[PDB]
Each structure stands twice: as C-alpha cells, then as structure tokens.
Amino acid sequence: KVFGRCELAAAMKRHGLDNYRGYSLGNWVCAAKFESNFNTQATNRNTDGSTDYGILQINSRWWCNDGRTPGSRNLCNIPCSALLSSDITASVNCAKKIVSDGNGMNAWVAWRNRCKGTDVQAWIRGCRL
C-alpha cells in the first residue's frame, strides 16, 4: 500500500506517534516519506546481507528476523514479513522500540539526512487529523 501524506499522518497519530519519546508527528511522516516514499511494501537489500523492510525501512540485522541475515539480533522480536503489511501496527511497534534507544531517530538515515533540522511540522500541515 502507498499511503497519502495526510492519510499516514492520521494513521500514525492513531498509532500513538505524535510526541512519542520527544518526537513530534511530523518527524515520523517525514521519515516515512524519505525512507520508503510511503510504500508499506518497500524493501532494500543492503551490502552486509541485511534488508530494510516496510514503510519505515526496518533493518533485518538488528530489528527483525527474515532468516537470511548473518549477525541477526531480532531486537523487535518479530518476523520481517510482519513489517510488510498494509497495516502499520507492527512497523510502529518496532519503530517505537528503536527510537527508545539513546540514538533516537538517528537510526533512520533518510530521516537524519532529509528531516532532522527541517520544519518537520510542515509534513502534517494541511491535513485533517
């Protein structure tokens, strides 16, 4: 599924990401935009053999288990396939555990490069929430 900007903002609000651990909602919508272009089925194979899954491109080496990644740790205790659903529940649950580490949202490279330091609130403006 490819979410519309406002559609995802509303969904993420229902999923409790607005002001989760100090991060305003715009951060999450902006992150999804540059990490997967709002596509829940997005996948990206990496060099180390790991793969980034879903709307928030969660990595198979540290966060989810896809059974094909070397030093996998499955920190989110969830199969990577669960992060490829049109239902964002699992991706949000895992994203919350990720951001709860001291590194915060810096875990998301696209967010760090295209969102951090920008007017992230702009990503939820002009939306019925």
Epitope: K13, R14, H15, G16, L17, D18, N19, Y20, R21, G22, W62, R73, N74, L75, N77, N93, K96, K97, S100, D101, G102, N103
Partner: antibody, heavy 113, light 107 residues
Amino acid sequence: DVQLQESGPSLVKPSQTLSLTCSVTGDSITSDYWSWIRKFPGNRLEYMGYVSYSGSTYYNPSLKSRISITRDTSKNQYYLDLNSVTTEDTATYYCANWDGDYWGQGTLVTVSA
Amino acid sequence: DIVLTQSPATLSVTPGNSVSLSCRASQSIGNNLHWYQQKSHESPRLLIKYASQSISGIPSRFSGSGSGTDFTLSINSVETEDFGMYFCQQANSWPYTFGGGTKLEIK
C-alpha cells in the same frame, strides 16, 4: 526460551550501595533492552530504568541519579546498583525485558540499621 | 511526569460477571498505555499492549480500549484466576510511570 532471575543480598544497611544481578538464560542479553522495576509496600510500582542495545541508559529522575544499570555479555547478566539507600528503598525488585514479556520472580530487599 | 490515575481503587465482583477498570492520564499519550496483572507473591504479567493490542498467551476475555487520556481494561466474565491487582503503565514519555492500581476481589 527465555528466563530471568534476580539474585543478591536481601538485607542491606542505610547509606550503603544496594546491588542486584539479573541472570538471563535462553538468549543473549545483546538481543534486547533490559529493565529494573520495584514495588514498594502499598502496591506502588516504580519503573527504575533500562539499558538499551547501544549501551544508553534511561534512569527515573525519582532516583536522584543514585542508580547505575550495567551489563556483562560474557556472563549474560545485567545489574542494578543503587547508592546511599535509605529505608525508603525497601521494596521488591524485579528485572524484566523492555517489552514486559519476560520478568524475574522478584526479590525483596529490606534496608534497615 | 505523566500521572496515571486508576479507579476504582478496589472492585468486588462475582465470578461470571464482567468488569471494566479505568486509567486516566494527566496528558495525552495516544495509544501508549499498557496493562499489567499482578498477584501476591508474583511478578507483573503483561495483558494488553498499546491500549488495545492482544498478547499471545493471555485469555481472550481481557480487552483494552481508549486513546488520548482515557483508557479501560475490560474483563468479559471474570474467572477466579483473575482476582489480583491490575496496573496501567505508560511508555509515551520517560520516565515510564504506573497507575496506583485497582484491586479486583471476589464478592
């Protein structure tokens, strides 16, 4: 599967450092975030803090920075140190993973002269 | 910190009847409210995560609902095994905090 178990002295003196150990069996401590929670008499629960995969820690401000949570991979254990305890630190201490799925049995520690 | 207030403090019920426990937050926390059960001499047990998400291994009679500041834990037809303490916990902001708890007893 995973199992957690607390260990350490049950009786401590005021002003000393209270230390507890949580032994994890079934998986590596490097694969989760680990926490400490305590229950005071009167059914009052307090989340003490947790250590995440990067080694970063989050401590409850209520503890006035008297707490330290560390890990030992080689022994697959993590620890709790609480400095300068007072009778107000008497409670049942539990270790559990961040998700809340795995908990130790809990251990009562009494602070008394 | 975010303060969680639970009510009633105690609730007596006859097995077979249903009950609902309340937990209200001092500020909006979205769906970031979790429910725990605790019996004397035992460690807490997670019943519901993120306000309404089910947990594998927990009886289906337990369900959670709510968002923002008002949440409830419902038990459809209480069983004797359900008597004990119930606590809500929020993980929206650090430090995580717990509600004062509700004691469910047999009537």
